[model samples]
Target chain A: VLESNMFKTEQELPELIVNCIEIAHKVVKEISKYGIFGVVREKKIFFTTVIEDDDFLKDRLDIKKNCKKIIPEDNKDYFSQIFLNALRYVIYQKLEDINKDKKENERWTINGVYICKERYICVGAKFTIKVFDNKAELYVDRKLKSVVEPKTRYEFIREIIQEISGNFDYINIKLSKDYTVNMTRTKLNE
Target chain B: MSEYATILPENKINVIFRSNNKYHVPEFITVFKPYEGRDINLQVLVVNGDNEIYDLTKLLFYEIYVKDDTKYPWPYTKTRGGISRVFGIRYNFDPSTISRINIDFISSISNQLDMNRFNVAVIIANRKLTKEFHDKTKAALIGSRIRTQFVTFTTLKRLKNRKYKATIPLPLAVQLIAKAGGTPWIVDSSIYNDLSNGMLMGIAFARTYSVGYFTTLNNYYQRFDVQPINLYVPKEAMVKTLESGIGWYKNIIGITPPLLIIFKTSPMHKDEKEAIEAVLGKDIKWVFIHAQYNTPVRIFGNKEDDYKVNRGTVIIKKRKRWNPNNGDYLHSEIVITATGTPRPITLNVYSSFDVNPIGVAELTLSQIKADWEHPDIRKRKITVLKYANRMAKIIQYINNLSSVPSVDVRDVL
Candidate 1:
């Protein structure tokens, strides 16, 4: 039976290889909450959490299992480093999952304009208008909805002229034929 | 022609005087403070390079004020210098106007600057200027013989158009920056449906302004006029940072915002949320918005409509089987313009005090669209992914220039 302290000496470091694989298996199951857990390399176990909105999780964690495999093994002291690295990889994988999930949740669609007037406001798609005077404030989705007050007749005319000026400033619009005269070329319908 | 009336008749000869200093005199100065508190009709005349007649009385002049030396509030320079000496003059005006205006009256100064090759002159007729009045003005300019060119204000509307176009709705433009996550304060608070008075503010790591606080009261959103404060809260001191920010906000507005919305770029730890709530007091609502860019699922709209999805499009994937442990639902929303290959922005509510996941999702999506004007999204021809990253950059810029939040971000970019 292998003792918990398997790597007692540099000469006996190879003995901990079996325990490293066993510890990696437990670590995989422990972090199974993140997503699918599997071993990508003989000594490396990977934790992958599929992004809910997408098929692939960009952030994949690979946990190195065999601490002994690393070159200059003598410089490394503890057998627990194997398990510690695995745990660290699991935490990184969890963080990645959280980040990926948050990214996937950012999608939204415009439901069209919410039109508001002095007395009433209504969604553009639905013609259901309600009484909302200048004093009335409207709320949507638990927040105050912005009231887009329609322009008065005079303001509307001014805006139209301004828009025309803005567009025509850069480009000139020419008529196909001179229609300045009151006389019409085409005959009136009988 | 009434003697009391300042408006000149169309038959009256209007003369234009040109000045050498093109930069000092404003193209148009509307507020004749000398006539303030008195009823007077003013005739506005516009002169061209070649003397011409134009009826410009209908064209309005936006006010240009000239103020005495004044210092801006703290954190900004204390000693008034440069253009600060002349208040109410837009920053674009000449700085030397302070000294120049003292010796020469605005009109005489116009003549003394130069006479031969002057720019178009604006003649403000208090009442009709008679030949005697012209002789008097000529005598006022003893050395220089500045002859007035006769011109009617016929093309005043066209000149007015050019002047009007120069003045953009700066507040509206700034509002776009706030919505894009550049500034903490939003000018049109009505656009943000979730925001209300007396709420705790939680900014995501990426959303924190670089240096100062954003304040909006009575629809004017701007950076607080104080020394810049560090808005960044390292994960280790999240709770403490929030407490201080909340306190500072209270001091400015007299009441804290009621709901705390943090658009977090990093994943929020459970302990961190608990700690934040612990310090902010249990009464305030905490809404954590995990805002990140990676859109794993690529969704396309109807090909018939050019695969364009409107703003505020939301898709919620309820867990295959509801597990109370892992969130009951995962939500995705397209907050920006998405055409053809849609890059939807995902906003997952990591935690909330009183709001449900769906409620949180709706509020976030609505606010995002509201803040970032939908029309801008539809109009700009940029990839959705690029726009998403731009939003993050804007927020970072806002944080960096927290003290001068009103500075046009486009200039910084």
Candidate 2:
């Protein structure tokens, strides 16, 4: 069962590639609420970034690929570093325009973490800057699983431990030695 | 199978008993005897009916002795037997430890027990012992750290009439074990199966303050600390709280373990994180987790079988990031630890280096086994949080077992 990965141990993942993939993921999760989805189209990847906004409603309008990946046949090509950031810029602008109308307090910035407005409910992720990797490339890594039930529900305003503890097995053991230093050993049957 | 995806490590869990480890909890206790502790001598203090107390105690003791017939019927194994034979720690009445009092002693019954430290005090009251008297007695009993199990006459009377299903004395024996501070069963270390001797710790906050508990497959006892932070978690309280928790951890394990895995109900805050590194500093490894059981998220296994997935089914959902080429990655997961209309718990991890979701899922799944009071039943929560949460509550209120003058925090649950 143990294949010899000893050779690939050191060279398997380069620091630079790890940094790029990590930051790219943060941005995608944060902006997913805008109906924009990201999927890796190929190896070294293509962040098949596309919008499924209310304006265009369904996949019938564009023959080009969308992020949902519900359908297998579609065209999503890789872009250069400059071209990738350009798409990122567009999504950023669209997000800004959409947020401009809402109340400043309720507005959810793409931290890629879920935040519910009222009573407790959850959904989505956030975006943060990549300090380690200064470059961006349009490549592929992973695909998002469309949520089966209610899209996603996560709450940041967690109940203090009390709610969950008040909120809220057994393996029986016998020892040759005493169970605790405090306890006098259980007396055996005469 | 496709729709109702049951994870590999299923709901049935195993506990390590050098005698013989088994998947069934009842069978395990019967065969494995007990993982720890010898014979527990129980003394009964009758408040009103002396004959009622003695008769009930003898019947309960006799029930503890007579071996089982077909209650557990785990056909694969012959681990079926009585508490004394299967569990070694029989509930024989301690003649020397007995004291019969017609009227309520408390007011100083507490002081009475403090001077006399028996393994466990079985107090059978005529009526339900009210909060004032019980608390007062327990407060007195706390001085010497005596653990008392309060049983009511009505309850015992009803218990005797029930015609003894072999399982009748199960709760009584389990509660006595808790009072004696003996862990009947511990999660088999094979699950953590890692070579590392890391500590699994839980930090729980109460309405009054916060408390943290530390344990591992290697060392399992109630070693913890209660901190003062009125509902709000602050840096000072967290620092001292963590300091003593680690202090107790080091003392018990005899060495500072390399890794310290922590599960806190609330998300780790900026100050809390800083306080941790400040206390832990450089050498120690930290695994931070925020486990919130009550969530609105409902996960159904495909469209089949009424969405009833087996326990321990974890779906690691990939989250999309900005880079289209590399959009989604494993950020978090949903773990259905309990059966029933299963609402899985979410475990969000924040680590310095990349760790596998399976690792996080396995360690957690292993601990959220059966309940302590009733080992046969399943629980939605993990032991780390469950114990720490209760310990936190008891720390705020203080319990009788913690009554010892040179106090060690006693686990109320």
Candidate 3:
């Protein structure tokens, strides 16, 4: 019933949450290079990375969460927090690219990120990136700027990163996975 | 039952007055007054019904100053220009006269009344004549609307008071529940403004072989409105139907809610929750609230038979033994009675993230009681189970009416 900024402090998080944050960091790196995203629901940690840009790598991470393991009893809040952090990290990395550009008029600031189980993660900002029902939609002040349906979660993450990086310059970020400061600045001009 | 009273709107009194012919004068001039500034500014319209400006002006001047007892002195000379200056009266006795009344005249009158504020208008007309005068005047006004209960001299003479007993004020009862952090089912749309927070949505689902109705609050729990997604059905396709419903809601709102709380009539199955999660994704926080009405566990007050727990009673049972691995028992169940006789509705918590289950149950039960709108619980024990059955009957009625996917059943009861 309450909205959180991913997690307040990583030290205060449960072990399961810390694991999710670390996994998200890896996902961020993978998405930047491979242009695809993967979700490992089970504890087995089946990790894979494909850097090649081809049709074969387009829909690689198409597997859904194991239905048996995805029961209601499975700490949903924990997983929800995990997904939110992962999303924030992806957005942050996207902003990092925008920071390289010094154009004052090209800056975009993130307002908030909303996640739901219906296969959508919406990042609210001057320009928004909405991944709804497995389709990626880019909007500037509610106007549809662009849209894409990436086959993989990594590709989904990659598309948003590319979209924000191309349009925005300065990005104001709030990444809960790191504990340096609550609010920080990123300038691509530097 | 005889001790209770039922309140109804007073229909006979003509709050709006009208005049038709030169001879007939509406009784509302004598009966109605601006009570506490609630009355709308009076409009005296004179058309070509008799083509007698002197008689029409005299009749209207008599009704305003003599009958209504207003301080405005009636002009002794009944000239068309004299009456027009004195009472700000308008006349259209001829065909070209209507076009002479411009928007400025209407706008000036409209400006005197609040542009956004509510006001009433009384349209005066003749039994025989074109509706141009009445229609044009009513249409020109910005905020006020002409009352449908038209008053003529004939109807005004026949009006009489009809006495009726008043029922428990439903709006007050609804407000009480809403104040306690619950969304009550609103039967009348007019009662919406009386509610603290706007209503988000109402969900009807078949729970335990019966359909139940539940409403979600807008900006009650968080910044965004909560979603009603925990509708339980045996079939897997029902999840798809629910997903479609959520999609439809998203399209309407243009954005997704920050948090969603699904109040389940029965315990949500693993498969059902998974299916729902598949549609929701990971960006938004959601929780399932499950309540039980038929429970083997019962607690009593003072004397076992003589006294029972009060209707709004709640008790949180802590775990007898604590385990470090399991953590403190975050789960709790509470008893809420719909009636004074203690027909208990046990609120059972299955899964929650950061909220107190007992508190949520109390709020939910409070709204349920308000929706029932029963004056005395001692007379009727209206538990959630019974409420669900009632909702099921309504749903059946709605289904019979049409094959529409969704129906607004607030007025069905």
Candidate 4:
């Protein structure tokens, strides 16, 4: 009789909490390499299209402008979708250059040496090269729910590293010939 | 007959019938025999319809001692089991050794039963053979039940724009903090007042995490008096104050404040939403506050509104029955009522020492005159010991109630 009780499994998070999480994610994405900024007025969501001269960043500006124009004047919810699309395009373009056709042996060569226990060999040389461009499906409960897009945040970073190393190897510029590059973290002047 | 067994219908013995109904069953039958040294008390239980059982040696005994100045006033009663002397007779009774005479009687009846369906057994005995007397001697057994009722009482505290307004009473606040398992000394109202909305939020942060010390600058405290303190603190200031204040309070309290600060407010203000958000960092602990306000257009059950003390009363009633030895007969009970409402505050030592609005005893001798003629100084002690005595009585009652098994139902015969 004392144990008569009940528990409900409703995700009762406050609306403000959900808003805060969304805001944080938006802030991080806006400051990313190529992102569009938007300001919402009374009932309209506006987009910024001022392009910086860098080729890597220019297309993002046009894309942002086009995205704003395509959204309906009444609906303000295309913000997250438009933002994701702009980021997705820029990241995919960066990934394409790395996976371009090249010789099999030369493409996967290591450009730096990794030494351990006073013994050393070319680093990243024996990595298997994977060429992935086809669309894949993600299933939920045996039904196709979403199509697998191109490289995402982590995938793009991995592809970029692979392509840059492949290019360096092609040039025969050995990285580990001198010493290991120390990693550093820096903030923007502004 | 043995104390543990019942006598059959064919047995030759004096049987004094005492009952309201002819078919009534006696719970116990006690037999007594006077000896040169002491009186023998034999108890027998009827188990079934056709069995005669006797327990002479294992019978119970009762002794009454009376003198001009007796050493012990109460009777000395005891029971023994196995072969024992019973009026110089070697009676053949069941040799059952029982700690309780009642248990032995029940067990003997159980062994004699033809069928074991009934839960109760009967005992039969003669009235002349046993010295039986009955008197109305009222004895009370008392007990208490203690439970944290999970109640919330709210008070509306007036506040200025900037000056420190004390919202919580120090003692009550300390008690609440103690109940929450928190350090009471760390709750500095001055420091809390000086902190800016953002800094004060950090103070809340310190309190929540049970951080020992937290410092915050006073900034626009007055400007945000309308909102809950938690919500008033800016997001950045909240995070900064919390992180910083934990470090600060740690050195002060000597121990870290726990991760949750148990708090209550007198009145729920819109500004308090921010205040709660500020210190609690969006994690709202359980709050006991007044219900929603009643608007003309809508009806809201304002339970707190019912609590108002308008007028008081003192009721005096004479006990229907009394003992001359105990002395006092009239029980003067005073209960103060305000607005036709009677609020019973739990009588405690602290409350007993409390004074009225003008610093006089709430129940002064003049207000409740006790009869000085009574042997017991009920009035003189009421001011000093009334509440404490009442509390002690309550505690005793609770203790007695707790000792008995919950399954056993006790009732007066």
Off by over 4 Å in 4: A1-76, A100-190, B1-177, B180-413
**Tens digit of per-residue lDDT, candidate 4, span B40-89:** 12222422212222221111111111111212221112132211221122
lDDT of 2 by residue, B212-276 (tens): 66776433555666666742358998788667666766777777766777787766676766776
Residue A140 of model 2 has an lDDT of: 12
Give the distance in Å from residue B148's predicted Cα in candidate 2 to where it truly belongs.
Answer: 1.3
Clashes of 2: 45
Candidates 3 and 4 compared: the better one by TM-score is 3
DockQ of each: 0.02, 0.02, 0.01, 0.00
C-alpha positional error of residue B248 in candidate 3 after TM-score superposition, expressed in Å:
3.9
lDDT of each: 0.30, 0.46, 0.32, 0.22
Q: Estimate each model's TM-score.
A: 0.33, 0.57, 0.31, 0.17
How many clashing residue pairs, candidate 1? 40
DockQ of 3: 0.01
Q: Which ten residues in a row have the lowest lDDT in candidate 4 chain B?
A: B130-139
User: How big is the positional error of residue B185 in model 2, measured in Å on the Cα after superposition?
Assistant: 2.1
Best model number under lDDT: 2
Candidate 4 interface RMS: 37.2
**Per-residue lDDT value at B33 in model 3:** 14
